[PDB]
Amino acid sequence: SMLIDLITSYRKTAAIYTFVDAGLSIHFKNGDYVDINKLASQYGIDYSRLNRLCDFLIEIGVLVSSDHGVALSEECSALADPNSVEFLTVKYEINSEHWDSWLMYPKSLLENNGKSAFEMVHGKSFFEHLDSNKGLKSDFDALMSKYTNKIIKELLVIYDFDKHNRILDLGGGDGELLIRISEQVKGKDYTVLDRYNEVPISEGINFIKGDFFKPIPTGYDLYILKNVLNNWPDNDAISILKNCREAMDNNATLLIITLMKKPQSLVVKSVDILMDMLFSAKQRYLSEFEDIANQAGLVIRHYKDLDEIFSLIELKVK
Amino acid sequence: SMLIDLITSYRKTAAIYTFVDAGLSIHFKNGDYVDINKLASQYGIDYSRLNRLCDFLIEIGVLVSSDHGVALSEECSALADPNSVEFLTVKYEINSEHWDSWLMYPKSLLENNGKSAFEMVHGKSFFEHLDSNKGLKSDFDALMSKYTNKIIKELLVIYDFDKHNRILDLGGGDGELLIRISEQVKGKDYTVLDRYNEVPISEGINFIKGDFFKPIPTGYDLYILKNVLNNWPDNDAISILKNCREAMDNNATLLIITLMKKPQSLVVKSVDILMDMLFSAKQRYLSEFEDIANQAGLVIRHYKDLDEIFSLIELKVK
Numbered sequence: 001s002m003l004i005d006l007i008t009s010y011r012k013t014a015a016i017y018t019f020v021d022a023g024l025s026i027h028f029k030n031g032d033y034v035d036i037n038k039l040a041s042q043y044g045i046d047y048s049r050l051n052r053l054c055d056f057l058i059e060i061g062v063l064v065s066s067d068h069g070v071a072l073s074e075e076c077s078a079l080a081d082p083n084s085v086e087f088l089t090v091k092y093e094i095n096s097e098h099w100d101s102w103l104m105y106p107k108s109l110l111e112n113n114g115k116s117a118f119e120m121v122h123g124k125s126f127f128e129h130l131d132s133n134k135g136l137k138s139d140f141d142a143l144m145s146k147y148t149n150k151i152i153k154e155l156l157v158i159y160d161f162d163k164h165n166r167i168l169d170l171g172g173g174d175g176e177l178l179i180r181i182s183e184q185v186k187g188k189d190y191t192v193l194d195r196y197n198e199v200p201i202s203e204g205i206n207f208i209k210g211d212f213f214k215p216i217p218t219g220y221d222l223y224i225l226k227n228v229l230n231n232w233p234d235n236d237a238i239s240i241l242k243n244c245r246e247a248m249d250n251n252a253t254l255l256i257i258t259l260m261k262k263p264q265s266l267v268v269k270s271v272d273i274l275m276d277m278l279f280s281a282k283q284r285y286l287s288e289f290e291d292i293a294n295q296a297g298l299v300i301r302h303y304k305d306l307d308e309i310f311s312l313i314e315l316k317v318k
Numbered sequence: 319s320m321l322i323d324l325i326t327s328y329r330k331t332a333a334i335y336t337f338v339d340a341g342l343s344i345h346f347k348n349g350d351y352v353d354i355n356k357l358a359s360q361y362g363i364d365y366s367r368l369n370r371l372c373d374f375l376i377e378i379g380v381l382v383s384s385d386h387g388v389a390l391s392e393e394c395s396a397l398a399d400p401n402s403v404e405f406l407t408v409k410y411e412i413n414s415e416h417w418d419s420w421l422m423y424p425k426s427l428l429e430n431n432g433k434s435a436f437e438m439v440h441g442k443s444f445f446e447h448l449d450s451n452k453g454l455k456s457d458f459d460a461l462m463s464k465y466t467n468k469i470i471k472e473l474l475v476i477y478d479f480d481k482h483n484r485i486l487d488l489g490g491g492d493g494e495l496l497i498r499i500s501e502q503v504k505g506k507d508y509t510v511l512d513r514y515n516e517v518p519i520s521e522g523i524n525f526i527k528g529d530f531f532k533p534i535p536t537g538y539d540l541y542i543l544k545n546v547l548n549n550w551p552d553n554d555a556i557s558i559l560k561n562c563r564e565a566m567d568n569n570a571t572l573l574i575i576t577l578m579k580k581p582q583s584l585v586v587k588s589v590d591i592l593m594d595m596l597f598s599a600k601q602r603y604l605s606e607f608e609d610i611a612n613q614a615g616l617v618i619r620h621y622k623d624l625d626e627i628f629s630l631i632e633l634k635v636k
């Protein structure tokens with residue numbers, strides 16, 4: 001009874017989604033028990049329908065039942081606060097943008113053309129779409145901020161940023177990485193390069209409106225590519241790394257912060273197929289990072305894991 | 319952890335769907351191993367794109383890896399044969415029809431109107447849409463054939479069908495229920511009533527083009543409603559039962575075979591949400607079946623669970 005459960009497990013995602021999307025989850029903070037009848041009235045939902053949804057959520061262990069009402073389980077508490085990796089994943093991923101594409105994914109395999117499953121559906125690139133769909137961009141940036149904040153602590157321990165002067169984050173969106181590093185390391189020129197509609201404003205953090213497919217600005221002694229190359233096939237990844245080498249002098253260092261694919265890595269493997277669907281891209285093994293680095297004329301000096309799924313790679317021009 | 323795994327678990331569904339939809343799963347019969355680079359070459363898929371998909375399928379436990387290729391695990395062997403409950407569930411459920419409806423479900427809750435989440439997406443009713451998409455109706459009927467075959471053995475043991483001469487199955491798709499009884503109980507007039515484009519063909523089985531919302535044909539001593547009523551709200555459900563009672567005489571019997579609304583079953587709980595999403599309908603307690611049957615002018619004589627999920631109801635006229 002494993003296979004049928006794997007196939008129908010999507011309904012649990014969908015049930016969690018409707019509970020978040022209808023704005024009900026916000027009422028379940030501090031494991032507080034809430035009355036289904038009063039919740040139905042607040043949002044003008046048929047109690048009968050809302051009680052049946054809650055019964056399904058009880059069976060999948062999301063909600064717990066009492067004579068006081070229903071509350072979120074200890075394991076599913078994070079549905080309460082909007083700024084959790086769980087809540088923001090529901091907002092970012094559970095929508096037509098991904099689910100229309102997942103349905104088109106089997107066609108993108110059979111029709112081997114330059115179009116990703118997403119491109120076939122939307123008729124644009126994923127990042128071209130985010131320019132239009134503003135709500136999804138803010139959700140994307142919010143989810144990416146959480147994955148940045150898991151890393152800052154071990155990143156600041158493992159790598160020495162204090163030795164550098166000028167730092168450039170290639171594709172750093174809202175400069176969360178650099179904002180968080182600037183918090184624990186002062187006396188540094190922090191700059192973020194990314195394709196912006198409106199350039200983000202800060203103090204101490206510089207924001208360039210550029211493109212890493214065009215020659216990258218010189219002067220920087222530290223370049224960073226955090227969760228970028230996994231959005232680009234080998235030929236496009238090489239293009240980005242070639243421009244990095246050209247922009248780098250002898251002493252300059254390139255930091256790759258990525259989800260490292262390992263023979264045992266479910267979390268990284270599920271995201272691998274997601275990157276294929278969206279960008280026709282992938283997560284890469286250590287050997288695959290060297291392959292694209294060697295073709296760009298860069299050499300791997302250091303590689304170390306930051307946590308269970310994230311890793312760091314130091315590349316220098318040699 | 320629980321919550322995030324539940325949210326992202328839909329990617330496992332999508333992975334299995336893609337593996338089936340593209341038509342690869344057929345090459346894994348009798349749990350026999352297979353080369354990826356070979357598979358990729360046959361259908362014209364980029365080795366990388368498919369090998370990465372198969373890498374993820376190994377992690378979730380659907381495939382097993384080895385030096386000489388990949389195979390379907392013992393637990394996921396059912397993906398191989400086309401007529402399996404798991405395969406037919408993938409073909410039927412994992413498509414735009416359900417997935418777009420799931421994404422609309424939280425809108426249908428807030429918009430407290432008669433229109434189901436399906437109607438809000440498709441504009442038509444579920445069965446109105448199936449009369450246009452012939453391929454989905456074939457997949458739907460094929461899946462309902464499997465859920466019939468689970469019940470036959472115990473249904474024949476629990477109900478004596480040899481005491482009946484003329485038998486009408488109201489909404490019996492391809493008459494699997496009557497085909498499977500016609501094998502075990504012989505010399506009977508087996509007629510199946512349902513909305514059809516092309517009338518199904520089977521030895522010793524008649525097939526009427528009919529609507530149970532219109533007057534039902536008299537002169538049958540057994541009428542059957544298997545997995546019909548739970549597709550209809552109370553008012554539509556009572557109309558069907560009213561037509562049944564009016565069609566029945568004093569000696570006639572009505573069988574209802576249905577998923578009873580059980581308090582503890584996760585399988586039954588998820589299907590209830592599915593009935594709301596597709597039909598604006600619900601599963602009913604034994605007391606709620608009495609209510610609608612009472613209003614229709616029918617009495618309950620026999621109720622019995624055929625297994626953990628399905629149950630039978632004998633109704634008579636008075």
Ligand SMILES: Nc1ncnc2c1ncn2[C@@H]1O[C@H](CSCC[C@H](N)C(=O)O)[C@@H](O)[C@H]1O
Pocket residue numbers: 127144145148170171172173174176193194195210211212213225226227228231
């Ligand atoms: N051609 C291009 N030039 C520059 N940045 C680009 C780009 N195409 C995509 N990007 C940016 O690449 C980023 C990928 S997501 C990574 C964001 C950030 N480094 C983090 O890890 O949190 C996005 O911010 C996107 O805007």
Ligand SMILES: Nc1ncnc2c1ncn2[C@@H]1O[C@H](CSCC[C@H](N)C(=O)O)[C@@H](O)[C@H]1O
Pocket residue numbers: 445462463466488489490491494511512513528529530531543544545546549
């Ligand atoms: N108005 C209507 N009149 C008659 N049959 C209808 C109908 N609307 C739907 N149906 C039929 O009702 C069935 C519900 S699904 C159940 C099929 C079958 N009893 C089984 O268990 O295998 C479908 O076959 C559908 O075609």
